[PDB]
């Protein structure tokens, strides 16, 4: 939701998490599949130059 | 709302702008920020992870 503002001391402000509006969902990160696969395969074919 | 499962509520008391008086406040801290204070078997005396 928001930066709920708690006041501490003579003028110090501490910002925290207030409510949550909406439902709860998970935090994800998305990578494309085939781009990752052939980039990984290119690293593989460039890594067999050192290991025979 | 009874179904968050990653963030706790964690109400506490704190010092206001007058250092004589204290007030009751609440937040929503994330779960890896918080460790239990093992002075008993009660799972309600939680604390912040940086306090030691």
């Amino acid at each position, epitope marked *: 939701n928001t930066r709920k503002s708690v006041r501490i001391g003579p003028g110090q402000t501490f910002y925290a998490t207030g409510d949550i*509006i*909406g439902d709860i969902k998970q935090a994800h990160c998305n990578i494309s599949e085939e781009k990752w696969n052939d980039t990984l395969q290119k690293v593989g074919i460039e890594l067999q130059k050192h290991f025979p | 709302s*009874g179904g968050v499962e990653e963030m706790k509520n964690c109400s506490f008391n704190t010092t206001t702008e007058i250092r004589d008086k204290e007030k009751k406040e609440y937040a929503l801290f994330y779960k890896p920020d918080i460790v239990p204070l093992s002075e008993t078997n009660n799972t309600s005396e939680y604390r912040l992870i940086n306090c030691n």
Partner: antibody, heavy 126, light 110 residues
Framework: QVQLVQSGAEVKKPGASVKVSCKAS????????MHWVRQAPGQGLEWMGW????????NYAQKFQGRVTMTRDTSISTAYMELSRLRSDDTAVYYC????????????????????WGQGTLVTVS | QSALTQPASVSGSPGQSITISCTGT?????????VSWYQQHPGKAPKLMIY???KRPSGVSNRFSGSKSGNTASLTISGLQAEDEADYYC??????????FGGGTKLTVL
């Protein structure tokens, strides 16, 4: 196929509480949102807050907070409503409807895509 | 944040197109494109006509069409018959997981 059945018509006194049930059959009940609406006779429909039958999460609309509670039960697969402190214009018809898909990665709560409905419940007060 | 602004009623002769519209608040309709249209027959449950501003559901004839332009949202029907004796309702997202409906447009055939 698919069914959304509710209870029969009820008459009540002001200041009481009324319980409205909505049973879903024919599909996996814990995989979709449920939104409820209320229609006074003569005027249009009126939204009420939704329910998440997986984790029991609740959100309610404005001018309804405090006097409505919405629960679910996955063993009987039925959503319940307890509405206390009735008032004179609450003689109406109550519907339950199926919402969006529980996506686990995107917020599909307020998506206004209601496909299947119940038969309606008549609630009268005097 | 009241109900969406909707006309009172419209009248339509059979066999001609007619357009009905809602207007609202830019924070509700003018930002999010999650606008749906429902219709009601007197006595039974309502039935959905459109999901998005224009993306067709199943089990409906290829006759309704929806559009969104800024604040305004509109439904056009073409070649209307007497089977559409219903009243129409807007349905919109509003933020904070709240849904705002509309007033209602009674449709009378000739």
């Amino acid at each position: 196929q698919v069914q959304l059945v509710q209870s029969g018509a009820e008459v009540k006194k002001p200041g009481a509480s009324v319980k409205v049930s909505c049973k879903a059959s024919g599909y996996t009940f814990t995989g979709y949102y449920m939104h409820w609406v209320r229609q006074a006779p003569g005027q249009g429909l009126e939204w009420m807050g939704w329910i998440n039958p997986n984790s029991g999460g609740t959100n309610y609309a404005q001018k309804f907070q405090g006097r409505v509670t919405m629960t679910r039960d996955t063993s009987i697969s039925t959503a319940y409503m307890e509405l206390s402190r009735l008032r004179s214009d609450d003689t109406a018809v109550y519907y339950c409807a199926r919402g969006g898909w529980i996506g686990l990665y995107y917020d599909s709560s307020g998506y206004p895509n209601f496909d299947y409905w119940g038969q309606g419940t008549l609630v009268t007060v005097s | 944040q009241s109900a969406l602004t909707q006309p009172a009623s419209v009248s339509g002769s059979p066999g001609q197109s007619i357009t009905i519209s809602c207007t609202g608040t830019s924070s509700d309709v003018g930002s999010y494109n999650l606008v749906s249209w429902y219709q009601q027959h007197p006595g039974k449950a309502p039935k959905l006509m459109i999901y998005e501003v224009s993306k067709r559901p199943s089990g409906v004839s290829n006759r309704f069409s929806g559009s969104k332009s800024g604040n305004t949202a509109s439904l056009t029907i073409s070649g209307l018959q007497a089977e559409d004796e219903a009243d129409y309702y807007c349905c919109s997202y509003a933020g904070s997981s709240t849904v705002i409906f509309g007033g209602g447009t009674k449709l009378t055939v000739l």
